Amino acid sequence: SLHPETLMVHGGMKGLTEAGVHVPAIDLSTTNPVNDVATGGDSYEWLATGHTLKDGDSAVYQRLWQPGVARFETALAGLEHAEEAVAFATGMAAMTAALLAAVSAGTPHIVAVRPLYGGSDHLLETGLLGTTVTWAKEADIASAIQDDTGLVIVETPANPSLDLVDLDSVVSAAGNVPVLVDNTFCTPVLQQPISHGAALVLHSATQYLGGHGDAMGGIIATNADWAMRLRQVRAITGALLHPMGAYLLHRGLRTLAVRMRAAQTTAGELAERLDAHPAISVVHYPGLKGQDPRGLLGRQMSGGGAMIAMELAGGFDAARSFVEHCNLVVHAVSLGGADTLIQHPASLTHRPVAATAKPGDGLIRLSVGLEHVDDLADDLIAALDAS
Template sequence: MASIDTAVVHGGRDDLTAAGVHAPPLDRSTTYPLASLRSGTADLARLADGAATPVDSPVYARLHNPTVARWERGIATLERADAAVAFGSGMAAVTATLLAAGAIGRHVVAIRPLYGGTDHLLASGLLATRTTWARPDEVADAIEDDTALVIVETPANPTLALVDLAAVVEQAGDVPVLVDNTFATPILQRPLEHGATWALHSATKALGGHGDVIAGVVACSEERAQALRQVRIVTGALLDPQAAYLLHRSLPTLALRVRAAQNSACELAKRLQGRAGVTAVHHPSLPECDLDGLVDRQMDGPGSLLAIEVEGGYEAAARVMEHVALFTPAVSLGSTDSLIQHPAGLTHHVVDDEARTASGVGPGLLRLSIGIEDVDDLWDDLDQALPVGPTG
């Protein structure tokens, strides 16, 4: 298996030389010529059953698109998976996985915190699922005969809490485990290597990396991928080929971007720990945030997201967001530029108040997505925006 640094550059480009091109072509066709009615029917049936590729023709773009398929092969390579299936957003990917796992009308075990949208989807029962919220060490007890899947995020959005993936998989037994790997990216963590069934991404984040694409993707076995493709075909939760083209264009720089941002996040975490007015810093690089040594055990680095708690609660946090100049006060993450947001008021606002507080998302918590700007410039911006504490 090629190093991940090589895989990001070459992933999904296997057919380009034979096609006589150097850059992945953007195919915007909605329909495709058929060599014969017979071969068209065969390909339609094959794709509707969840096959990865047609034999002669994609038939219709809701069944298959070559530009999307190339980017999917790239993601599968990075996640060390048989296959990956792309969707129109991260939430479409979560929904499709629940559908493909047969979770509708059944039971799900979920570990908080999760991204607010995922939490809301499960807590609201909008897809007729019934959820037991469990701590990581309660998963075995939470499993029922009817449990369709276990869902977990690590590092978790927005607290950066780490969960031992191998331990969750062991407790889940025969029940499949869905890991939202958005924060780590496949550069830093590959959940399938720890026994997970699906590794899911909001590709809107670091995989896209430039804040201009909404997308989702799930990496898994070919058998699981077939079920996901079937769901995608009938629900139409497609990734637009233009978005797939941009995502593939972002792939070769993924490792460079993730590591550059991560270096700055580690440095800022250290500086913020000593900053008056900051009462807590959450970043997996800090020993107190990784008591079980999970970064070494299941990751290749602590990542580029961090969270801080500021003295003065909501008002102080709101003031920081109003006073930053280089950081953009905005939701989302994983872009080349740095973003700052208030989870309790924004990304996790939809989460039940009590559950949100219990999972560590309080009024003074700010989540920072570090970009690839100069670290001293980022520090200066935070330092001038943070409240002047008792010693500062």
């Protein structure tokens, strides 16, 4: 019954007002005492087998359950409209757990759609976790699926070029196979993959959910079956989210709508000014005219986002000079933060990607922050004029 702006502030804050406290406490306890051998043992088995902690039951150990992490999990699950959510140390740890869950189930094959984040792409290419990958285009998903396929890894807008994918078509092509959508760039503010029929939704909480570049994290909003499988892997592989990391990511969700709306407004205006510059040939931004032929803005995405990628006319040398002459905009990886960042994907985020699949050498990715539009445009224009 409440709007998403209200649910970002009060999500995962259940029972705190009733207990006479304002924010969730940070419990650093590694162990959690048990009342007796029978209840302690049953709670251990329930949690180790991937189940949610029962109300009025001991967490037993942090690798089995953490209350602060659990609050962050229920907060994001409510925003994505998923049954449950499982949080890990990083976005890669969440990807690792989802791949190990599929391998453990007897479905090691993965049908993935490029572009994807460099690490997600490299982890599937190497097959470190016993996975086999089949790189397929959006239209050729149904054909690429084998009896051995466990998941369909997709991402929209893609990292770095912001390639869009119709989630309704992907779910239709996947059939009985579950679809994993990496909704890091859009966030639950702009896109809700669960509504389109995605089984699991991955987020690199490090970006946008944290929002201040000071909390690493990874989280998958999904149904109870996949949450149980992810928790089974988490309890034995232990890629845990620290109680303070969970606190800051949950804290960041309270300002996610106001931060996304402010950065999106700045980005929509910057993409127009940057397209007009002669040094830039192509500007990739969903909110621009022509960039949305399938009509996914409105239907799937309630906004253009705060990420802008661009192809330089002078190729690699112009792209290199552009990031090196930025002063206010900082040359660094990561996104969704309070400050504006810029980077060459082929040299940093997508460096472990295969040569054939690497992004363009003239391409530059930018994360728009909460600074004034004029000060960011002045700095980016001066950097382009330096070449």
